[PDB]
Amino acid sequence: DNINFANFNQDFSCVSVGYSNGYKIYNCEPFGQCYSKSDGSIGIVEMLFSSSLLAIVGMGEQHSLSPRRLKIINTKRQTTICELTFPGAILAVKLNRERLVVLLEETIYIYDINNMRLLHTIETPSNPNGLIALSPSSENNYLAYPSPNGDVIIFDAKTLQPTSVIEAHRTSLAAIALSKDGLLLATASDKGTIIRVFSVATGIKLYQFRRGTYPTKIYSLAFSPDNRFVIASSATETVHIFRLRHFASLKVPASKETKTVVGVGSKIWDDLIPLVNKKLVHIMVITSEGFFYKFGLDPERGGDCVLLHQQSLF
Template identity: 35%
Template sequence: MKVLRFNQDASCCVVSAAAHQVNIYNCDPFGKCFELNDRTENDGHETSAQYDTAKQRSIPTVDRGFIIEMLFSTSLVAIADRSRGSSNGRKLKIVNTKRNSTICELSFPHEIVDVVMNRKRMCILLESDQIYVYDISCMKPLETIDLWEDHFKKAVKESRKPSAGRVLNDASRRRNSWGHRMRPRMALSGDDRSILCYTSYSATKSNPESYLLHDVVVYDALNVAPVNYLNSIHKGNISSLAVSHDGKLIATASDKGTIIRVVATGVDSEYDSTRPLLHEFRRGSRPCNLYQLVFNRNTTLLACVGDTDTIHIFGLNSTDGNGIPNEGGEDERLLANSNSDTLRDVVGSGESPKQLATFLSRHLKASIPNQHLRRDSAHIKVRVDYDYCVGFPEEFPNQVYVASSDGTFKVYTIPSTPGECVLSKTSSFT
């Protein structure tokens, strides 16, 4: 079984029991509320062809089966079926689940990778690294965002005009980008403000011909205009991205998967461009593939899911006595400067080597990056041989839902003090 995703308020969960079958379950009370079972064949492709869960663990919503996005708990669902060849993978059906009928069908020049929507906008990411923005009320196309075109515009603006050979090489990479492990990510805020955040390409300093997806563009999808550009949030590619319900915060994790950062998007009037980093958490010391980040409705909790045996939940309201230093940021520089001044005082006073060693252990250690990163405030132990998806229900702020590819749906209670979540209910997707 393949767990696709929860809807925006975690009132429903979408699962696929087979390549041709999609079911939508209501979470409370638990039960199936919609079933799509299509065994027909198109273009000579078997519906079960290339549906390999194990190969898609790092990108759970992008596979050769279904890509589905619900509109909260309404009957409107967007469905793209990649299991029956590229021609079907380019079509997006807008379905009314109550009438079990197709409202409209949209066709695109390349296969669909991801779909996100709220009550105002729908955004479709294609494997050509293009994002189509639609007015969901009338399904009118509003804008096409080309990530590669925007990258080259930025290069020209910075007087880094790409050569003809480089453009040709980029075009070739773009056409074959589906084979690359790292792909652009996008997320849309759940409110009517419709803040779209997506990763963007940028050339590395050491090699202009090499690219990283470690920048994030903040885009106003409601008014179809860019808002902010956040440079180099991580050293490596961003593998997972989430935006808060109000669009004010984004959470990111790199392909290393050890550090999670929460950054202000800059859409509010109190935004401080010199200090965009608000929280920084350490998931663990060993690298892993993090394939889901999700905020709760009130932006007080952040959950992350990867290919490890633990689902982590971080508290966004708690603060450390030591603060949360930004690696390479203002706090770290101030701390380092302060330590440098004190070091000069110690050396200049002719103190003994023992006193100097004591100073180094007590003061300089504090300026090491990531020394004070906070750990999770709650966690859930899981088995590593299954895929998982989490959701925070709006009606029950002290609970978290976990759907698993082993066919189970579990409800956990989040503890009031740091520790392991308590299992309160288990159901089965049957």
């Protein structure tokens, strides 16, 4: 394909992948397949941390799979928890320990993941690019989604009330992300010149970073799990690392306008590199072509990140 879909789980410790003939789970550290399952064509396959709970959506209409349907399964018990049938293409599925959120182009569905009770529905301006962020923290259980121009609505998925409207950018968003603890929001507009970081709990703009001079498509934002860094990849295939312009950067070895998703490992590693050992933050890049590139970031010195490993998800 080489792949239909690939995403990190919530703490960047695994990657889930959908293919024309099934889905796989990979551990990031060390890299290797830890689950495989033959099936139909899989469009979305999302994890719940490293539990055995998977959320699965078909790519294309099949007998037992569809883009309009969500299957919640348990890999250990090898059972189906439920299936939910929606009135249109599922653009995104996000999860934490208290909530399941399902995104359609003009509707957000919020579930209690414990009993699968539909808790609340949100009608929205068209979100064809399927932008959404859901806090991995049940204590700070916030949901962020755009409301076009570049407004971001913050929603309290615990109390089911709106919290704030953040005027992130003048034009429509290209990318969005929340921190591990749910408390920081990072944004970029479709112009991708400026990256912003907001306090979710107060709406306060904490940071602002210039990605570059000329506009570009930002594919992906991510926080380090300690809130020390925010990362951004784009169509130029330059990935920038901003420490809360760049403290560090790296170049993804892929053609221009290759879509990427980025993640950062939670631990600092004592990598042996040409010899010295350097304690490095691991930045991971998944390309639409199914390539997995792991770079090492010097949290002290920054600069251009060394490529540590290339893997393949196919």
